[PDB]
Structure 1
Amino acid sequence: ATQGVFTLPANTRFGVTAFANSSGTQTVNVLVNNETAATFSGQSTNNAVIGTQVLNSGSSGKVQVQVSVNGRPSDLVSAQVILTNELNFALVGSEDGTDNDYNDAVVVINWPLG
């Protein structure tokens, strides 16, 4: 099944934040309406916050997260969760290797902001 694609409410500011847990340097691309809007990268085995940004979901509300290590796409897993019918998280894990820890890059999307 497709993973790492989320329909947000249109024209909405959201936070996107990436964490690294791997020997390899991660690259996280964040697309809004099918165009790259942010790119984060770093290397940490201790959950470094390699990037954080505020983006706008735009007219489509379509947000996609892609993860790669030195040109190789990682395997994604994802889901969305809503607390008290108000607070939204879109969650991505990724695996670059064989251990299936799926934390090699972790991406959290949150809205609303403000």
Structure 2
Amino acid sequence: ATQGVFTLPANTRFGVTAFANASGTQTVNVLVNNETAATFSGQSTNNAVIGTQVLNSGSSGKVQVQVSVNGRPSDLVSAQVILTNELNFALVGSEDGTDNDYNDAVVVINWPLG
């Protein structure tokens, strides 16, 4: 099943934050309406924030997260959770190797802001 793709309300600002837990350098791309809107890279085995940004979901609301390590696409897991019918999380884990911890890059998207 496709993972790392989310439909947000149109024209809405959202936060995106990435963490690293891996020997490999993680590259996280965030695409809005199929175009790159943010890119974070970094290396940590201690959950360091490797980037945070606020983006607008645009006319389509389509947001996609991709993760790669030295060009090799990571396998992704994802889901969206909504609390009290108001607060949205779109969550992504990724695996760059064999241990299947799926934390090598972790991406959190949250909305609404403000």
TM over 0.5: yes
Residue correspondences, number:
114
CA distance in 2 between counterparts of 1:35 and 1:26 reads 19
CA distance in 2 between counterparts of 1:49 and 1:78 reads 19
CA distance in 2 between counterparts of 1:35 and 1:70 reads 21
Unaligned runs of 5+ in 2: none
CA distance in 2 between counterparts of 1:2 and 1:24 reads 24
Cα offset for 1:53? Answer: 0.2
The equivalent of 1:23 in structure 2 is 23
CA distance in 1 between counterparts of 2:89 and 2:21 reads 20
Unaligned runs of 5+ in 1: none
Report Cα offsets for 1:48-101 as digits up to 9, x if no partner. 000000000000000000000010000000000000000000000000000000
Cα offset for 1:8? Answer: 0.2
CA distance in 2 between counterparts of 1:6 and 1:62 reads 6
CA distance in 1 between counterparts of 2:95 and 2:61 reads 26
Report Cα offsets for 1:14-62 as digits up to 9, x if no partner. 0000000000000000000000000000000000000000000000000
Query: Could you tell me the TM-score, scaled by structure 2's length?
Result: 1.00
CA distance in 1 between counterparts of 2:34 and 2:74 reads 19
Query: Could you tell me the TM-score, scaled by structure 1's length?
Result: 1.00
4+ runs deviating over 4 angstroms: none
CA distance in 1 between counterparts of 2:99 and 2:70 reads 18
| Identity in percent | 99
The equivalent of 1:109 in structure 2 is 109
Alignment of 1:64-103 (within 5 A): 64-103=64-103
